[PDB]
Amino acid sequence: SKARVYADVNVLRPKEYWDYEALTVQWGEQDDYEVVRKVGRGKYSEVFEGINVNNNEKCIIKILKPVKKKKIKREIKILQNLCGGPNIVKLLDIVRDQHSKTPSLIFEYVNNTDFKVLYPTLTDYDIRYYIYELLKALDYCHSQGIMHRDVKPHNVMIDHELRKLRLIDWGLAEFYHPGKEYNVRVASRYFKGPELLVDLQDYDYSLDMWSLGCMFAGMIFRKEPFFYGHDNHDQLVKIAKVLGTDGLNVYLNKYRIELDPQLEALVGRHSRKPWLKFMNADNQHLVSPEAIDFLDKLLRYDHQERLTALEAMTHPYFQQVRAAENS
Numbered sequence: 001s002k003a004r005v006y007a008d009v010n011v012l013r014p015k016e017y018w019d020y021e022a023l024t025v026q027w028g029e030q031d032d033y034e035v036v037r038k039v040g041r042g043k044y045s046e047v048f049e050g051i052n053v054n055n056n057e058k059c060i061i062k063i064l065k066p067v068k069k070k071k072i073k074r075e076i077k078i079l080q081n082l083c084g085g086p087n088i089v090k091l092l093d094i095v096r097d098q099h100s101k102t103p104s105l106i107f108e109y110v111n112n113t114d115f116k117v118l119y120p121t122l123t124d125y126d127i128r129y130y131i132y133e134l135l136k137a138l139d140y141c142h143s144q145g146i147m148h149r150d151v152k153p154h155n156v157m158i159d160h161e162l163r164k165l166r167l168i169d170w171g172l173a174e175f176y177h178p179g180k181e182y183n184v185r186v187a188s189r190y191f192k193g194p195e196l197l198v199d200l201q202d203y204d205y206s207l208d209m210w211s212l213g214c215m216f217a218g219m220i221f222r223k224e225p226f227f228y229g230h231d232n233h234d235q236l237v238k239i240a241k242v243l244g245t246d247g248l249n250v251y252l253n254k255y256r257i258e259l260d261p262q263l264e265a266l267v268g269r270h271s272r273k274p275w276l277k278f279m280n281a282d283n284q285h286l287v288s289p290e291a292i293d294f295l296d297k298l299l300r301y302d303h304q305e306r307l308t309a310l311e312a313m314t315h316p317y318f319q320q321v322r323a324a325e326n327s
């Protein structure tokens, strides 16, 4: 399997672009940024709203926990490669604690509204606008040869009042190389695509489109997360109960994949369930034909059949967003 678009970006660019184990950090001043209040975390870090002492503006401080040094160089190099791209979180400085050399990443501050509270207030149009904005970041990162690999609502900051979106958290991201087998232990469970769960390691930028589709399905069906499995195996079973197992078997045999037989038995045999069977009172003001048509072209087992970020932004579903953007 190879990417259908932007497959040669790293191929054609200099080794330094993508050779992040060779990064050379040019540390800033740890004192310029002060911690004001904890806003998030990961198994990987502590994230605080900070203040830039030199100009008084809010900032974000991402204090990294001890991990192999390559993991830190990777996240930094990707941020520097994308800095300036549409809706890509801006990395402002990199600083360390003299004593422990604990690295902290400094970012622009986005005044986010938690998605469990924001998403449910969104109008149909806003959903369209925000997914469109998130698509600009994904088309931009794919075009630069990088997969995000952790597309999910906690990694999408929205300042609703400013109608500003930033695709944050490039900590799992990677440079795309035609033919490389990648670890499949990436992304959040609800957003893991079929290829991660069936162990197809030579995946590409299309994994991010499956993750975007799960976010979209959650928004229009008012159901978070939309594929709610307790562990990986179960995550593939929740997928197979919606998409049907005929499609899966087509898919497994296309790429020459034999599932683990216990997994294979959990999965079982399920008829495809049309999308409209999730339509209800609460979500019917959001489930029209274009939404379904669009969602259907994102949530496909075959990563090769899924829309690319570029195709997705031109889908008719986003016509009004495009026109508003054009005048």
Ligand SMILES: Nc1ncnc2c1ncn2[C@@H]1O[C@H](COP(=O)(O)OP(=O)(O)NP(=O)(O)O)[C@@H](O)[C@H]1O
Residues within 6 Å of the ligand: 039, 040, 041, 042, 043, 044, 045, 046, 047, 060, 062, 089, 107, 108, 109, 110, 111, 112, 150, 154, 155, 157, 168, 169, 170, 171
């Ligand atoms: N620029 C930002 N503006 C506002 N809030 C932010 C910003 N960056 C990060 N946060 C918050 O910090 C949380 C975690 O930081 P993030 O950069 O996603 O992750 P990580 O520590 O590498 N975690 P994870 O998603 O588990 O891998 C997010 O889910 C946000 O709520």
Ligand SMILES: [Mg+2]
Residues within 6 Å of the ligand: 042, 154, 155, 169
């Ligand atoms: Mg995160």
Ligand SMILES: [Mg+2]
Residues within 6 Å of the ligand: 042, 044, 150, 169, 170, 171, 172
């Ligand atoms: Mg992360």
